[PDB]
Amino acid sequence: TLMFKRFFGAVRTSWRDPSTRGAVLSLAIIVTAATIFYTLAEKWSVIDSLFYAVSVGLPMGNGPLSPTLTLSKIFTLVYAILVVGLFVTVGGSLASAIVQNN
Amino acid sequence: TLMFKRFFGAVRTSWRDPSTRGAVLSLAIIVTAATIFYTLAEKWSVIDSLFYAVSVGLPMGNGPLSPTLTLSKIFTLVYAILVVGLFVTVGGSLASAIVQNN
Amino acid sequence: TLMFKRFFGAVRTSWRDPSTRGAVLSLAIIVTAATIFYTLAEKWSVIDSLFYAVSVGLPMGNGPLSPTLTLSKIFTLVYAILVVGLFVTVGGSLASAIVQNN
Amino acid sequence: TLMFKRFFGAVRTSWRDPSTRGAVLSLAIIVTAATIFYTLAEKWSVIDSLFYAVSVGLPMGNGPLSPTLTLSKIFTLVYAILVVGLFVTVGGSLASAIVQNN
Ligand SMILES: [Ca+2]
Ligand SMILES: [Ca+2]
Ligand SMILES: [Ca+2]
Ligand SMILES: [Ca+2]
Ligand SMILES: [Ca+2]
Ligand SMILES: [Ca+2]
Fold it and tell me: How many CB pairs (< 8 A) connect B and C?
């Protein structure tokens, strides 16, 4: 039942490009690295990993998932300051691209 | 006595319009879209279903509520990336409207 | 040992005023209401209520507490969208006023 | 394997300076003061104390950790309103900083 959101969401507003949404490319790399780490550091599954990853840069909210080891705890601190930005502008450009599509 | 909030709130300052507080229009569809999905997929009640939908763009804070199923995990990201921007500009406009309302 | 911050921060940086930090008045007024509701509606203590109030618009996070009544659940939903923008601007003005203090 | 994030990230683009990244200074002093407080009041390990201290500026989400004493609740409100804007402006400057590196 998500077909409306996936196709008319974070695939629709992608096909709308200036140069400083090279930030969605930067997000991709910090989010995927983060996902790669959380799977391996924290033992979690991919989806749970990508969930927690995105959860530290948006208001969204980690479920049960949160770090348990010093390594991932510190990593989350370092990553948390880097991704906070990339999300913010991707949310903004993505948001206007909704209203420009109406 | 939630009245003075809902009435001197979402109703009162929600009627200060440019062309671009048609964001509220874009929002209402996206919160609604999410609420239908959460009710049906996650099986939650409408209010709790809405509670989670409004949670993923705002610092409000999701309850015990988090997605338990893969679709509800996946969908929560795609929705969460788009709405977070929609939530903000609307939240700014209303806040802007409270200050010039005294 | 917080006597340092309360004087050095919370009551430091407010003693600096433009036109727009009329926004503190409105934020002040929104939070007092919200707290009163929770103590009265949701039975919690003044701080636990006052903490949840501040939890919803800033990212800090509520620990244990989450509203349990359908009534208080909506109250937070409505109250959430109003207060967030006031949080932004008082939080932003106040932070710049630290940097102009170094 | 966080080395790739730590060196390629929260120091590699941390050292990209205008006048207005004097906030990173102000962040370091306030983030430190909090961590000291949280270590002392809340009994927590320094790491966890730093994990909560950052959790409240950023979208991260504290773990199962949260202020359980009244002082530490009283403290967190005052500190969250001060430190949130600093996390914000640094998050952008750091964000602009990854994109300027392409
Ligand atoms: Ca949050
Ligand atoms: Ca989160
Ligand atoms: Ca949370
Ligand atoms: Ca939230
Ligand atoms: Ca919060
Ligand atoms: Ca947070």
Answer: 90
DSSP string spanning D38-90? HHHHS---HHHHHHHHHHTTSSS---S----SHHHHHHHHHHHHHHHHHHHHH
List of chain C residues whose C-beta atoms are within 8 Å of the C-beta of residue D78: 2, 5-6, 9-10
Experimental technique, in short, is: X-ray
Distance C15 CA to ligand 3 centre (A): 33
Task: Tell me, rounded to whole angstroms, the distance of Cα C45 from its chain centroid.
Answer: 16
* B102 CA distance to ligand 1 middle (Å): 30
Short-list C95, C94, C66, CA closest to C80: C66
Asked if residue B18 belongs to a known ligand binding site, the reply is no
Q: What would the two tokens of residue B3 be? A: 């009245």
Written as six digits, the tokens of B10 are 């979402």
Q: Tell whether residue A18 is among the known ligand binding residues.
A: no
Measured in Å, how far apart are chain D's first and last C-alpha atoms?
Answer: 22
Tell me the domains of chain A and their CATH numbers: 1-102 (1.10.287.70)
Task: Go through chain A and tell me how many residues it has.
Answer: 102
